[PDB]
Design an enzyme around this catalytic site. Structure first.
Site, PDB file in Angstrom:
ATOM      1  CG  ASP A  70      -2.151  -0.874   1.014  1.00  0.00           C
ATOM      2  OD1 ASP A  70      -2.857  -0.724  -0.002  1.00  0.00           O
ATOM      3  OD2 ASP A  70      -2.392  -1.731   1.886  1.00  0.00           O
ATOM      4  CD  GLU A 196     -10.094   3.925   8.321  1.00  0.00           C
ATOM      5  OE1 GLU A 196      -9.597   3.387   9.335  1.00  0.00           O
ATOM      6  OE2 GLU A 196      -9.481   4.767   7.630  1.00  0.00           O
ATOM      7  CD  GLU A 197     -10.335   3.291   2.133  1.00  0.00           C
ATOM      8  OE1 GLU A 197     -11.309   2.511   2.113  1.00  0.00           O
ATOM      9  OE2 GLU A 197      -9.177   2.931   1.814  1.00  0.00           O
ATOM     10  NE  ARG A 212     -12.341  -0.252   4.672  1.00  0.00           N
ATOM     11  CZ  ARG A 212     -11.334  -0.756   3.961  1.00  0.00           C
ATOM     12  NH1 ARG A 212     -10.985  -0.206   2.805  1.00  0.00           N
ATOM     13  NH2 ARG A 212     -10.673  -1.816   4.408  1.00  0.00           N
ATOM     14  NE  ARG A 290     -11.891  -4.907  -0.761  1.00  0.00           N
ATOM     15  CZ  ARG A 290     -10.858  -4.173  -0.359  1.00  0.00           C
ATOM     16  NH1 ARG A 290      -9.800  -4.009  -1.144  1.00  0.00           N
ATOM     17  NH2 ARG A 290     -10.891  -3.599   0.837  1.00  0.00           N
ATOM     18  CE1 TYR A 324     -10.827  -0.005  -0.970  1.00  0.00           C
ATOM     19  CE2 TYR A 324      -9.823   2.135  -1.331  1.00  0.00           C
ATOM     20  CZ  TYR A 324      -9.968   0.998  -0.569  1.00  0.00           C
ATOM     21  OH  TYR A 324      -9.258   0.858   0.599  1.00  0.00           O
TER      22      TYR A 324
HETATM   23  C1  LIG Z   1      -4.375   2.047   6.770  1.00  0.00           C
HETATM   24  C2  LIG Z   1      -5.869   1.924   6.863  1.00  0.00           C
HETATM   25  C3  LIG Z   1      -6.616   1.869   5.546  1.00  0.00           C
HETATM   26  C4  LIG Z   1      -8.134   1.863   5.688  1.00  0.00           C
HETATM   27  C5  LIG Z   1      -8.784   0.665   6.306  1.00  0.00           C
HETATM   28  O1  LIG Z   1      -6.120   0.818   4.730  1.00  0.00           O
HETATM   29  C6  LIG Z   1      -6.376   0.778   3.334  1.00  0.00           C
HETATM   30  C7  LIG Z   1      -7.278  -0.382   2.838  1.00  0.00           C
HETATM   31  C8  LIG Z   1      -6.953  -1.011   1.414  1.00  0.00           C
HETATM   32  C9  LIG Z   1      -7.915  -2.026   0.941  1.00  0.00           C
HETATM   33  O2  LIG Z   1      -8.835  -2.467   1.861  1.00  0.00           O
HETATM   34  O3  LIG Z   1      -7.940  -2.390  -0.224  1.00  0.00           O
HETATM   35  C10 LIG Z   1      -6.016  -0.201   0.431  1.00  0.00           C
HETATM   36  C11 LIG Z   1      -5.554   1.169   0.906  1.00  0.00           C
HETATM   37  N1  LIG Z   1      -4.630   1.861   0.050  1.00  0.00           N
HETATM   38  C12 LIG Z   1      -5.383   1.402   2.376  1.00  0.00           C
HETATM   39  N2  LIG Z   1      -4.905   2.713   2.772  1.00  0.00           N
HETATM   40  C13 LIG Z   1      -3.535   3.007   3.144  1.00  0.00           C
HETATM   41  C14 LIG Z   1      -3.203   4.437   3.539  1.00  0.00           C
HETATM   42  O4  LIG Z   1      -2.676   2.132   3.128  1.00  0.00           O
END
Ligand SMILES: CCC(CC)O[C@@H]1C=C(C(=O)O)C[C@H](N)[C@H]1NC(C)=O
Ligand SMILES: *[C@@H]1O[C@H](CO)[C@@H](O[C@@H]2O[C@H](CO)[C@@H](O[C@@H]3O[C@H](CO[C@H]4O[C@H](CO[C@H]5O[C@H](CO)[C@@H](O)[C@H](O)[C@@H]5O)[C@@H](O)[C@H](O[C@H]5O[C@H](CO)[C@@H](O)[C@H](O)[C@@H]5O)[C@@H]4O)[C@@H](O)[C@H](O[C@H]4O[C@H](CO)[C@@H](O)[C@H](O)[C@@H]4O[C@H]4O[C@H](CO)[C@@H](O)[C@H](O)[C@@H]4O[C@H]4O[C@H](CO)[C@@H](O)[C@H](O)[C@@H]4O)[C@@H]3O)[C@H](O)[C@H]2NC(C)=O)[C@H](O)[C@H]1NC(C)=O
Ligand SMILES: *[C@@H]1O[C@H](CO)[C@@H](O[C@@H]2O[C@H](CO)[C@@H](O[C@@H]3O[C@H](CO[C@H]4O[C@H](CO[C@H]5O[C@H](CO)[C@@H](O)[C@H](O)[C@@H]5O)[C@@H](O)[C@H](O[C@H]5O[C@H](CO)[C@@H](O)[C@H](O)[C@@H]5O)[C@@H]4O)[C@@H](O)[C@H](O[C@H]4O[C@H](CO)[C@@H](O)[C@H](O)[C@@H]4O[C@H]4O[C@H](CO)[C@@H](O)[C@H](O)[C@@H]4O[C@H]4O[C@H](CO)[C@@H](O)[C@H](O)[C@@H]4O)[C@@H]3O)[C@H](O)[C@H]2NC(C)=O)[C@H](O)[C@H]1NC(C)=O
Ligand SMILES: *[C@@H]1O[C@H](CO)[C@@H](O[C@@H]2O[C@H](CO)[C@@H](O[C@@H]3O[C@H](CO[C@H]4O[C@H](CO[C@H]5O[C@H](CO)[C@@H](O)[C@H](O)[C@@H]5O)[C@@H](O)[C@H](O[C@H]5O[C@H](CO)[C@@H](O)[C@H](O)[C@@H]5O)[C@@H]4O)[C@@H](O)[C@H](O[C@H]4O[C@H](CO)[C@@H](O)[C@H](O)[C@@H]4O[C@H]4O[C@H](CO)[C@@H](O)[C@H](O)[C@@H]4O[C@H]4O[C@H](CO)[C@@H](O)[C@H](O)[C@@H]4O)[C@@H]3O)[C@H](O)[C@H]2NC(C)=O)[C@H](O)[C@H]1NC(C)=O
Ligand SMILES: *[C@@H]1O[C@H](CO)[C@@H](O[C@@H]2O[C@H](CO)[C@@H](O[C@@H]3O[C@H](CO[C@H]4O[C@H](CO[C@H]5O[C@H](CO)[C@@H](O)[C@H](O)[C@@H]5O)[C@@H](O)[C@H](O[C@H]5O[C@H](CO)[C@@H](O)[C@H](O)[C@@H]5O)[C@@H]4O)[C@@H](O)[C@H](O[C@H]4O[C@H](CO)[C@@H](O)[C@H](O)[C@@H]4O[C@H]4O[C@H](CO)[C@@H](O)[C@H](O)[C@@H]4O[C@H]4O[C@H](CO)[C@@H](O)[C@H](O)[C@@H]4O)[C@@H]3O)[C@H](O)[C@H]2NC(C)=O)[C@H](O)[C@H]1NC(C)=O
Ligand SMILES: CCC(CC)O[C@@H]1C=C(C(=O)O)C[C@H](N)[C@H]1NC(C)=O
Ligand SMILES: CCC(CC)O[C@@H]1C=C(C(=O)O)C[C@H](N)[C@H]1NC(C)=O
Ligand SMILES: [Ca+2]
Ligand SMILES: [Ca+2]
Ligand SMILES: [Ca+2]
Ligand SMILES: [Ca+2]
Lengths: 388, 388, 388, 388
Positions: A70, A196-197, A212, A290, A324
């Site tokens: 990530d 989140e997000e 989320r 997913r 996503y």
């Molecule tokens: C670090 C927490 C975060 C939210 C749950 O994780 C993510 C989930 C991911 C995922 O569930 O696919 C991909 C993301 N690129 C990621 N964000 C970061 C900054 O690494």
């Protein structure tokens, strides 16, 4: 040029029409296409573009090996023309980092990228392609943001950030920017227990973000932001039509003010349009992974804990990988209403397809129609075996 | 900027000069050139561009395997600079779909793409690079349109659509758009018995479209459209110089109001300029297959069922593969007349060249000269063996 | 915008400085670089670009096999940014053909391309990126033109054409264009006995063209054009410093009004700046082949049949391949004088390097300095063995 | 447009944030990325770009073999969009040569490239993309310049040049250009004993350049230029925090007016911001080789021969290769102060990594923040083994 004002309501959504699709993985089998993930779409007043986090390598390149990772120093937010793939030669770098958001305020574009190690990350806020303000981590645990576009009103652009645990209580803040400068920030309030997000969109009532809960809930948290007063509230989508992934099966009573239980410590970025009887929710078809994507019309989903679908549209078949999803609109389009749009990230490679050593995606995007249009399904379309 | 008005007649056509040629297949042997088919040409007030339906893969890419297929989710209308090849890095996506038309009205460009499964297809109408209107299938059998440029007058842009059987009676409609909005549509009237893939051009008399009867006729159907009253008529080219492919040999009496018989359930997109004594018809040289291309001067071909050629020009030798052809003009050129132009699609690969697994094309295009110019022939120029 | 007027004299030439170099063959060893030949340079009021005849294939492409061939349907005049290489993705097609010239008149650019079989060739004249006028062959033997830029004054742009034998008396014409329209043409007059591939430049005195006598002479023919009266004269460079290739050794008396004998039926495109005591001549170093290039200051070379060099500058070492050379100037530069410039085509591949199956080139270009600058040498720089 | 004036002070530097990074070597493993070295960054009023000296070949190209070589005819100053890699298709050639500088004066950009053999080199000064002035070698021993951006005030742009020995007394000159014309030059004065590769920045006090003593000193020479009077002074950074590479260990007393001894005949291009208590110095972490990079806050480093760091920030870990570094600022940014920026060249390949036959680099760049931001480290990120 003037700052854009949110003065319209959503157009009536009776179906969804194809808006854009880049076929990036198909094309990248034999072209210099950058490995990406976390894509989105965002409009300028004169153009709409695809955005994503590059991994700083092409798919055929040997450095694609390990791109399930990530957060590296080789990531950057890039943008490129609508429905083209993200190539080395056509992608414009907005800023360097591994978590991002971006939006146009009517005059210029603000882009935010976060970079750094887990315990020392920092956001840099760019406005009109120059760095303007910087924000250091406040919880020292992966400062991170929306991964889709923000929304502006009269020059004020709210952005949701989280810092802290992804599987427990964390420190979420809402920042209000203008021309890249920090006007104000505030700690998360309301009944959402983890954020989140966030995927956001704006209309005359204000700014709505669907997020989320990566901790305990499989219903989605909602943050509603007043960009004039610069205040917000939060809760969950009340509907028993649960839209996180993975998730339990749909019950008959949802939860408005607490996580719906059954699945912990995971989730996926998603979105919704919450607009009374004009409400539509997006979700993966599978409850376990997913895969697949569908839109469901669920009247008053935000407030009605018994609400069920009365209409729907399949976007991606359950047999095909999704990922996503998030919201955007062309705020500069002609007409008396804002046409709801969204994208779906179509993830290929790891972890689900581990015969290749990379992880990337393509994009499909749709906008709403007032017609009742026939539906197709929109897979990534690449044959994984070609990459072996 | 103002809407363009059709205020001129056609220039006198005494020969044809080379206008553009992209050599796409030659170049794509060792470059990132997109697989395409169904190309055309269309002018903006400041630029003329090549257009086509991409297959969402390059020719050398492994995903070129199977591109004889017509309708997939990986197709899109792309445009690119005149005589350049359609590359991943220079092609601009206009919209997503597997049947299209596009035209500039003097102010902005309208593009229409149809996508969907056979029984649930829908058209999205784009204007100034934004989606504006949507049209659902009315016959639930491959809603489809021109595959070459439309033409506009005072902002009104007529487009011919067909939905229904390709080998029997079908439901053809003429739509009139302005700024992407539907002003009006009407069912096909007149004596044409089947309509596919209309090639159109405009002049002071109105808009003329030469189409493909895919059912019973080897003469071409003609639709004549009045863009002011928004009405039309239809018939066939009366001339016994038959211009569909495959086709019977030329008789001495043609048919004005019914299909000329002999070949059923096939055809090719083509065009003509019908202008009294200034009339020129295009056709493949072969009566059996899509090979060769010639222009023939046939006075009053539209109305005279005895008319024969009095002049001609070979464009592509019978030994070389041709394909679709269609009309376009630079309505924004200087002068007192509109210079007639056309393109020929040069199809390579399947079904005729099956040692490769792909189907693609290059483009050659010509415009008229008032001089009597020497003629050359213009093959695609690629060596198929190089791709093995 | 206004038409450019030739109102200045040449700057004093005391040496030559590097202007541009594209290293096309080096780069094309591992990049999508188009095979070309017959390059040149030409300026717009806001930009200067490289031009050449593409062969419609990249160097690494299998279709580069056989590109020693001069006239095919796959050639086109392309232009691309100064000192970049001609790539598939950055080259702009000006027109289709296998012999060309191009120039900007201050308002827009005129480009001319000739195409066709040997006995039926035709020129199409483009102005502001549209076709405007066409010229059919008059001698039915490879109608052909300058292969470097033309020059304009008050909108009038003279161009030299030849049609007929390349090894005997032929029909040379001077055409005068304005906005792409033919104002006038005239048959060659004066004492030049054969004219090919004129390199021209303009200044306040008028337009001067240095050409190639491909028949009997190793001195170069000169055509001097008055663009206002639209008349011309011709003779040879009187100097015994002979500048065609191949050629006899330099005698002590040249020829002003007839070919200097010794070498027949061959030659190379070249140039000179004829400006009294400010006169400089270009030539290959070798008298036998296209290798090396030097500039020699030869006072009154045009009129003095005893004139010898008093200064010089090596551009390319005799050990390195050269090729065509021609003149251009940035007529839109600041200052009280026009700075003389030239390019040298650096030919690689066949016939001299036959281990590869292709023929292409790169470009080096220089402009004059009023300083006495140190000299370097400027080879193509590619290693032929890398292509095996 | 107006000439830019240096009217602001430096912003307070409390940390450094990521500005740009192109990941060129990672991407160039499988893309047409030009081999480069000696990169920098320079802003126009509307855009900031990366600059470097191309080697006229891509990294994967066979001509990358031998690119440790400094001065060939195949080099050129190129520029390309911020944080994109330097590709064949996106790189713009500014001029031809193997040593360069460039800067925008508010109206147009001046670029200078030097080319030639060691004993006969010459600089060509370009302004607004045209050649304007030329400077011949004065010492006949590799005429050479800054390798990073120059700075302008009210149209006057000073540039530091050196000609002569790199390991002994040489002839350094400061030139003052306006619109590419030479206003004045002067021989180096002051106590600096040897000058190479000056990195400069401007503010209200004047222009400050930090250079490389390649002869006897491991402290850095400083030249301070008054762009209005067009005069300068020179000395060394007094601080015992030594910033050249290689270098002795830091003593407790530095040298203001003579080289600090211990290492001879080597060095690296570097930079500093000298601003009283706001002073920051850059240096490699290693004292032996070009590895690592750090910024150290050293109050009054210029004038205080006892000064030591009170704060710092690691940019590149000692385990990772660094290289040249230099200064630039966006003089056209909004605000009341100039934000200090710098780049670090991350050299890969020879001499340190000799399993490959090429030498190239990528770029990382940072700007200052008034926040105290967390730090990361920023390696090139390519795996050398992938290129074998
Ligand atoms: C670090 C927490 C975060 C939210 C749950 O994780 C993510 C989930 C991911 C995922 O569930 O696919 C991909 C993301 N690129 C990621 N964000 C970061 C900054 O690494
Ligand atoms: C050409 O294109 C067109 C346009 O796309 C196609 O037409 C479309 O067809 C699709 C597919 O059928 C439709 O999508 C479905 O819509 C239904 C909702 O509509 C139905 O129900 C409505 C509500 O009825 C209820 O209330 C009314 C009162 O208002 C009451 O009268 C009724 O009795 C009941 O109480 C009806 O109003 C509606 O009727 C209307 O529309 C009809 C056409 O659809 C028409 O014929 C009628 O005359 C009338 O006009 C209709 O009956 C959604 O329910 C459905 O979504 C569910 O099912 C899919 C699987 O197919 C699933 O993926 C969804 O997630 C969802 O089911 C899950 O969730 C439910 C809610 O929690 C749950 O109850 C289910 O058990 C299920 O849960 C399980 O799976 C999920 C997901 O994996 C998991 O999370 C759970 O845990 C659990 O495991 C579809 O969205 C389109 O609406 C329709 N569009 C249009 C415009 O018609 C057409 O087919 C194409 N033509 C061809 C030839 O192909
Ligand atoms: C340099 O370049 C120049 C410019 O391009 C070249 O000059 C060109 O040369 C070409 C090739 O010859 C010409 O194309 C042909 O044109 C003729 C038509 O012109 C002829 O006929 C005219 C009409 O005559 C009739 O009416 C007049 C009264 O008006 C009457 O007097 C006469 O007796 C008759 O009743 C004549 O007017 C014309 O004469 C004029 O022009 C002459 C130059 O051409 C000149 O010399 C004269 O002095 C006078 O000025 C001339 O005689 C077309 O008929 C022909 O097209 C047919 O043939 C080709 C094969 O070559 C074929 O592909 C076509 O499809 C077509 O033939 C098919 O269709 C017919 C109609 O149905 C049918 O009857 C045929 O049997 C045939 O059908 C079969 O094949 C088709 C197709 O596969 C299939 O579908 C059917 O089922 C069946 O199987 C050519 O187009 C150019 O016009 C000419 N251009 C110019 C400006 O001159 C020059 O050659 C080059 N130089 C060099 C050295 O190479
Ligand atoms: C750093 O860079 C600088 C700048 O570039 C370098 O300096 C340059 O050095 C080069 C190389 O030497 C020079 O090029 C040569 O120039 C001479 C001409 O200059 C000489 O002759 C002048 C004329 O003299 C005559 O008239 C005067 C009266 O005006 C009279 O006094 C005199 O006696 C005689 O009657 C002199 O004025 C001039 O002196 C001046 O300049 C000197 C510096 O050069 C200086 O020292 C003096 O003090 C004074 O200031 C000087 O003597 C060209 O003749 C020569 O070109 C010929 O030779 C080359 C081979 O080197 C050849 O390729 C050419 O084609 C040509 O020779 C052929 O053609 C001739 C004419 O037909 C013929 O006669 C020859 O036999 C020969 O023919 C053969 O070959 C050709 C070609 O293959 C073939 O076609 C034939 O058939 C046959 O086989 C050079 O161009 C630069 O001018 C000079 N530049 C400057 C500014 O100084 C410097 O060297 C570099 N530094 C370092 C360390 O490298
Ligand atoms: C999240 O991110 C943040 C932000 O980046 C991180 O916080 C940063 O942490 C780094 C790493 O520690 C810091 O960098 C170092 O800074 C120190 C300087 O600060 C120290 O010293 C200050 C000066 O003290 C002196 O004066 C004061 C009076 O003013 C007096 O009181 C004191 O006793 C003494 O006399 C102190 O003021 C300062 O304290 C303050 O800051 C503290 C936080 O740092 C805080 O805790 C305190 O409360 C107070 O607020 C602090 O003590 C630099 O000295 C150091 O640089 C040296 O060391 C590195 C190796 O780590 C080396 O590479 C450098 O080159 C340098 O050492 C070489 O040079 C020296 C000078 O010649 C020499 O003496 C050394 O022996 C050494 O020389 C050798 O190596 C070199 C290089 O190879 C070679 O050339 C020589 O020949 C020889 O071989 C670091 O730059 C940041 O400043 C700090 N930033 C902030 C905002 O806090 C945080 O860590 C991250 N969080 C996590 C969890 O990771
Ligand atoms: C579906 C009917 C239609 C017209 C006869 O078929 C076409 C003929 C084809 C052909 O004859 O080459 C190619 C076309 N891309 C196609 N159109 C669609 C929408 O698939
Ligand atoms: C046909 C006569 C002409 C001039 C002598 O020949 C040329 C010489 C050539 C050469 O001497 O290298 C290359 C040219 N591309 C060519 N021109 C054409 C139109 O083919
Ligand atoms: Ca969850
Ligand atoms: Ca038919
Ligand atoms: Ca000759
Ligand atoms: Ca040193």
């Amino acid at each position: 040029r003037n700052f854009n004002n949110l003065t319209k309501g959503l157009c009536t959504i009776n179906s969804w029409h194809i808006y854009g699709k880049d076929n990036a993985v198909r094309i990248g089998e034999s072209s210099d296409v950058l490995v990406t993930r976390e894509p989105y779409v965002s409009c300028d007043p004169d153009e709409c573009r695809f955005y994503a986090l590059s991994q700083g390598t092409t798919i055929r390149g040997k450095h694609s090996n390990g791109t399930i990772h990530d957060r590296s120093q080789y990531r950057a937010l890039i943008s490129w023309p609508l429905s083209s793939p993200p190539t080395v030669y056509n992608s414009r770098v907005e800023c360097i980092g591994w978590s991002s958001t971006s939006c146009h305020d009517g005059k210029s574009r603000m882009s935010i990228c976060i970079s750094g190690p887990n315990n020392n990350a920092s956001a840099v806020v760019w406005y009109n392609r120059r760095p303007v303000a910087e924000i250091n981590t406040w919880a020292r645990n992966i400062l991170r943001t929306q991964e889709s576009e923000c929304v502006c009103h009269n020059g004020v652009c709210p952005v949701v950030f989280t810092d802290g645990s992804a599987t427990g209580p964390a420190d979420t803040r809402i920042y209000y920017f203008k021309e890249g400068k920090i006007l104000k920030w505030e700690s998360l309030t309301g009944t959402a227990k983890h954020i989140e997000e966030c995927s956001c969109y704006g209309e005359r009532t204000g700014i709505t973000c669907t997020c989320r809960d990566n901790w305990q809930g499989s219903n989605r948290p909602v943050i509603q932001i007043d960009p004039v007063a610069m205040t917000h509230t939060s809760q969950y989508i009340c509907s028993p039509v649960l839209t996180d992934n993975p998730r339990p099966n749909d019950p008959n009573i949802g939860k408005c003010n607490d996580p719906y239980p059954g699945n912990n410590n995971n989730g996926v970025k998603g979105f919704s349009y919450l607009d009374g009887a004009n409400t539509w929710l997006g979700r993966t078809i599978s409850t376990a992974s997913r895969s697949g994507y569908e839109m469901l019309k669920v009247p008053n989903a935000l407030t009605d804990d018994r609400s069920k679908p009365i209409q729907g549209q399949t976007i991606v078949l359950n047999a095909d990988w999704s990922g996503y999803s998030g919201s955007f609109m062309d705020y500069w389009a002609e007409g008396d209403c804002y046409r709801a749009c969204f994208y779906v990230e179509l993830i290929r490679g790891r972890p689900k397809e581990d015969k290749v050593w990379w992880t990337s995606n393509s994009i499909v995007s749709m906008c709403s129609s007032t017609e009742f249009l026939g539906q197709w399904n929109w897979p990534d379309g690449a044959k994984i075996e070609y990459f072996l």
